[PDB]
Design a protein around this ligand. Structure first.
Ligand SMILES: CC(C)n1c(C(=O)NCc2ccc(F)cc2)nc(-c2ccc(F)cc2)c1CC[C@@H](O)C[C@@H](O)CC(=O)O
Ligand SMILES: CC(C)n1c(C(=O)NCc2ccc(F)cc2)nc(-c2ccc(F)cc2)c1CC[C@@H](O)C[C@@H](O)CC(=O)O
Ligand SMILES: CC(C)n1c(C(=O)NCc2ccc(F)cc2)nc(-c2ccc(F)cc2)c1CC[C@@H](O)C[C@@H](O)CC(=O)O
Ligand SMILES: CC(C)n1c(C(=O)NCc2ccc(F)cc2)nc(-c2ccc(F)cc2)c1CC[C@@H](O)C[C@@H](O)CC(=O)O
Lengths: 421, 421, 414, 396
């Protein structure tokens, strides 16, 4: 029943037959005889799941243990939203357990916050943090700035010519020409003041702009390319070396994100009465302030940290990001946080706590937020997709929730560290 | 239909009956108006999956769109390994697509590297980097250091006293006492050289040890508590302020991880022939070098980066980490990377490339690696679980593969930026 | 005699003798803090303070070789120094000619490090034979970065949003600007840390370095803000957000004082003969020392060989605040191939936070003015306010580059 | 020879492309030659040069010398440090700096004084080397971490000089690059030249074990010298020192014009939270660089080394029975300092070292004078932090 290569190939090349009329073993036989390249499987095979099934079968013969994929699931998942948009060479999916911490009492609302993690006690501990906030009267937050960035590097023939371009970009008329080119690429593109920096004949230019409820990499990058195209008409000796010169800065540690901000800059706060610190967090305000000063400020300082003046902000950021279809690699910068703890009240027994996070890189449209399970976690918070009547509000709201959940996480871990055990 | 709460409690307390003998609505009736909290559903209800269903039904009435969870899957997932171990208040799982990138030719072996992501083109781009490495004769790597850390902060009454504790810890006999206390807590606990730092009367002590194939936080922290307990015998006035004083440093950016290392320090390299750079990567060696210098070195420097002298190592680390059951929040430090490129060979036209990654925090036993799907990805690489013949070898191998896959990804993104998209 | 000497003080101290004034202090007829005003001449004030100090030392002949005579204390007293016991001579050597923007500078350098001046001089020579160096001032504006507290972080967020409106900034600008001729407030930069708000005021200062001028403007500016926000507390007029005399990435990224760039091309022949190395070797060492090496050491802004040496020496010679070497030494030195066959050395130095002035502070002293005069930048520039301080910043960046050329060549040659 | 000729005559021979007996006359002729190049030749007339002892400068401290620059020297003291009193010299042209430091010294005196300790001691040099492959540089790193490897490198380092005593090595790879941090004490000298000389023979010995090793540069910026760097903050360089003092509430009130509660609020939110918002590495202090710089110029130190020597974290806590007294500490992990060599060979500079009782080598215990000077810098920096922070908290 398994036919020779030549007969299998004419069926493959027959337009009203194709791969649907071949068996798995026949397509695999063609791949092993070098008649079909492995990468062509995607467009040849009719069903997305069958493409995955055959890729898995081919992969399995190459492994030192043939059954290693047995427990990697792949069936009955919606590959229609993933192929050609979210992932390639797909062999299945990786399930991450999702837990819920809440209610998180933030800006007079209540949020049930999804958290995808495999770290024991993180969800329960964050949920204790939420309790302390809820019985403490709730938290308030503000978005202080908003704008994704891209920081390309361009080269001029001399440092004198890069100084020329820099000064041209700071004149109102030169900026306006660049701004019109940038803003024409999308309805959300609103270029803010340009920040630039010279290193000899290099010039690093930092384009910042809102992006609606999208995280905005693709949008800002498309606007950046058009903006540099206009700049090249005025300076034709300029060389566009890279559309990212690491001055954005994206997915690496950098002081510029900390100081200037990137994406949403957020601040969150709360006052925890002495009673609640006692009953929920099992400690005193005094013990918490001592740990916070000497761990999160002084410890982080001795360690030579830029932007890591916090206990485990990245835990909460990472968990929410995975659950809500964010780019989890952007937790590098998005976890930037400084946690402050102060005595409040007449006897200094209440705890003022705040978290400031200047660089939360987040969105509710595009990327992994296109997928339906990820959309379910976004719907939990009432932030899924674009907001028609107030663009950016959904991404802004999700960013506030991230900072407030980070604060809940900070409360709980700092109490456990102050306690002992 | 739902009978009174009185009778329902009697049926639950009856061991021959239990929760099996109640309806979904009666379990929910008891939760609404105390008697059962919500977290006790873990241990009370007949099965794990029914507990999840009950928790989903509770959560849904709290949401402002009752159908939010519709597309968040939960049925037929193996929760036995998750409850009490990896996650709490569990309402389901989040599918993250997994693609394969390889073969990765590293140390005369081949690796089919699993990668869990939602960013379009990430897996295909890394896969191109792999082809360039494979046609170039392969990549080589070495593990330079190995030791997970914990960085407690203690205080003495005076800085003179904290100074006395530092000096005693620097004596051979003082260190030997502390090493004996640390090493008695576990078979893999083998304390390495101590690094300490003073901030007035504060003393930050960085304990470092290998940890078999486990990432090793729980073990090292246990060793740390016993060691501080022993230090207190010699210095009774010492207060342990926090078992983590942010001097480790864990899940925050810190120069000390960059300079001293944390977990596995790894270097990787490869020479890519000029022909391969032209054909596969669509660029030249001369162009790659100029972008790497001015983006990854000069660009990151202008941005104020500590440890972020690379293009997108965080993308590869994050995707391998999610796929293989690592703690994704450790991406913060694990993505630390310097990428270097230079002319090579007789013509001086071949591309030399190296990625050095001082702080890969990784493990093939514990946490998320206990789950079967992420074990399947570990098994692809041949690094699943502990290595009995050579403790630590699987975790070392996995760190080599991470640094190699990063180098692959660096080759392909850097070529794309150099060639102007 | 004791009470006879007190009688002569009631007329004066100039009539009295050294030993009698010292007798009056040791026996407690007169306290020692009163001698500053009673004694008329400044040099004799210094002399008596030295003699009173010497008896308290374990080696009373300590001050023998510390000089104090025949020096202009009238400019020092009440403006540059207190409790003055003399002065410290710092050798001044000269490196030049420095060929910068069609001019030629003889650069004074106060230092006690052997070979520093000569090495800097050899760099100037390689620059001169390469066709000279060019330079541009990219930005200019001294800063002060006060910290204010509000009752809540919602309130501080509100104040930041107010300062970001066209209407709020304009009101703060007017208050700031009324304090001084050259006080022209530029765009504000702020950061919140909870209920803290850090506000970075930045303005030109003519030819002055500008610290005391920007603080004056900052105080009056925060006074106007207080009327719009009564519950605001002014914690400290400097909240380290400036940032002054401490390492800080904000200075590296946003700049402070003069940001400057400088460049030159050194012909291959000049690299072989004057610098005793090759273009290929200079580039290899610069990449792996100043970029990769500084990166492995966790450097923010220290991507250079020894800019601090040159910055420090010029600064001491030219009456600058030498403690500002901390941030003023920020520098990145780049080297690449150039010319037909990639054999000439392109070199550039970028220094974004040179903190400098030609009026005020130690530039009001005459020896320091002489070194400023050597370079043609002493005092204020009448026709073009701030042009002298900009020129000195270009000289600093240019001399630094000469210093990077020489030292980097010596390291490459081994 | 030259004494027979006159000033105008000698200039003539230099202009015609073709030594003098006294050092002061050589300085005079250089000034006159340089005057011909300046657009205002009379600018040198108030730059002094007469009757300076140029014998210890030429061929040691400065070249092309045209004179000297007078920096005013004030005195802050007495500073009560480790049960002694120091009259601390400070060379500065910044008004109020000495008087403010002086007020900080007063405050510490009335609080029973300051105590300090030296936590570590070792100057460094951080050469960069290269190997064909990263696999080879990895091999070299591993070899340097064996006790046999370190021992042979130690023997080589230690043979170059009396005080050359090599401590643990620190290394970093960057591909085929290897950065190696050598650390040794250096008697009472700052130690740069000694540690470089030791580094040269050690690297030459390493080259025997690895003949394909290129020595790219003897300083590859891994030291790190005269540039900001986290490695100095974390590992230290030169003297790591700590200093402390408790100021009675009465003294904070009357001498410092503020409260303990107020001082703590400003210190936390300026020196910690502000420096953090500014992206600072090691700059968690108000103005340590003022004090370091002034003491350095007065005492013949390398003033360019204030970049790293200023590294300081200033901490302030509540203290005492009613929690009303002010605990203060400064911690400075990288004070680069010496009492012999460089500018400490000059007599004026030695006058200031003698005030402090730390001039020259300590014959009874080599390195104890430089250690003492570092302690004095840390204590005087703490004095300075007290006064300025009090002034800032009080509203001026
Ligand atoms: C955040 C959770 C997972 N967590 C907790 C926790 O919050 N426990 C209290 C708790 C537990 C369960 C509840 F239901 C309620 C409260 N304590 C520790 C912990 C601390 C020191 C140790 F030595 C080892 C574990 C961790 C791991 C922190 C880890 O992911 C980041 C941490 O390393 C960052 C840092 O502080 O440096
Ligand atoms: C990593 C992949 C997804 N990728 C690629 C890519 O590898 N393209 C080449 C390619 C693609 C598919 C193939 F099958 C083979 C080769 N180009 C870009 C990109 C660059 C600049 C833009 F403006 C916008 C997109 C990205 C996203 C960059 C992002 O994840 C990190 C980047 O922002 C970090 C940085 O360099 O700053
Ligand atoms: C700048 C001068 C003082 N200098 C020179 C010098 O330029 N010599 C060449 C020269 C000499 C006289 C001339 F007339 C012409 C050329 N070579 C070295 C030197 C470097 C590494 C050593 F191991 C040991 C000595 C220094 C000390 C640099 C020092 O102050 C900062 C340095 O540590 C910064 C760094 O690269 O890390
Ligand atoms: C240290 C002295 C010179 N000083 C003083 C001072 O100590 N005053 C108290 C005092 C004065 C005289 C006495 F006799 C006794 C006590 N207040 C200020 C000052 C001015 C404006 C300001 F906006 C911020 C401070 C300065 C200049 C600091 C300056 O060199 C570093 C500063 O920029 C570092 C910083 O805090 O950011």
């Amino acid at each position: 029943e398994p036919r020779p290569n030549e007969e299998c190939l004419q069926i493959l090349g027959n337009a009203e037959k194709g791969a649907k009329f071949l068996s798995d073993a026949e397509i695999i036989q063609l791949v092993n005889a070098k008649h079909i390249p492995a990468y062509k499987l995607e467009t040849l095979i009719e069903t997305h799941e069958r493409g995955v099934s055959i890729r898995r079968q081919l992969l399995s013969k190459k492994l030192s243990e043939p059954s290693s994929l047995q427990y990697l699931p792949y069936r009955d998942y919606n590959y229609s939203l993933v192929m050609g948009a979210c992932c390639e060479n797909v062999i299945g999916y990786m399930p991450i357990p999702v837990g819920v911490a809440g209610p998180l009492c933030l800006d007079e609302k209540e949020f049930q916050v999804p958290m995808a993690t495999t770290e024991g006690c993180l969800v329960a501990s964050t949920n204790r943090g939420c309790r302390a906030i809820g019985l403490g009267g709730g938290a308030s937050s503000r978005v202080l700035a908003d704008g994704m960035t891209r920081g390309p590097v361009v080269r001029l023939p001399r440092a004198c010519d890069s100084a020329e371009v820099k000064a041209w970009l700071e004149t109102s008329e030169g900026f306006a020409v660049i701004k019109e080119a940038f803003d024409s690429t999308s309805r959300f593109a609103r270029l803010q003041k340009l920040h630039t920096s010279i290193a000899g004949r290099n010039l690093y230019i930092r384009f910042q702009s809102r992006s609606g409820d999208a995280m905005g990499m693709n949008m800002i990058s498309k606007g950046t390319e058009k903006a540099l195209s206009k700049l090249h008409e005025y300076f034709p000796e300029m060389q566009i070396l890279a559309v990212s010169g690491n001055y954005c800065t994206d997915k690496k540690p950098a002081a510029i994100n900390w100081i200037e901000g990137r994406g949403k800059s957020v601040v969150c706060e709360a006052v925890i009465p002495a009673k609640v610190v006692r009953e929920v967090l099992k400690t005193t305000t005094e013990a918490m302030i001592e740990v916070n000063i000497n761990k999160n400020l002084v410890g982080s300082a001795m360690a030579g940290s830029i932007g890591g003046y916090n206990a485990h902000a990245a835990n909460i950021v990472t968990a929410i990001y995975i659950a809500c279809g964010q780019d989890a690699a952007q937790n590098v910068g998005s976890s930037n946080c400084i946690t402050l703890m102060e005595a409040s009240g007449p006897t200094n027994e209440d705890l003022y706590i705040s978290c400031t996070m200047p660089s939360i890189e987040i969105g509710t449209v595009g990327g992994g937020t296109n997928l339906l399970p990820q959309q379910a976690c976004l719907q939990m918070l009432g932030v899924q997709g674009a907001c028609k009547d107030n663009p950016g509000e959904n991404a802004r709201q999700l960013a506030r929730i991230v900072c407030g959940t980070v604060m809940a996480g900070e409360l709980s871990l700092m109490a456990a560290l102050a306690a002992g055990h």
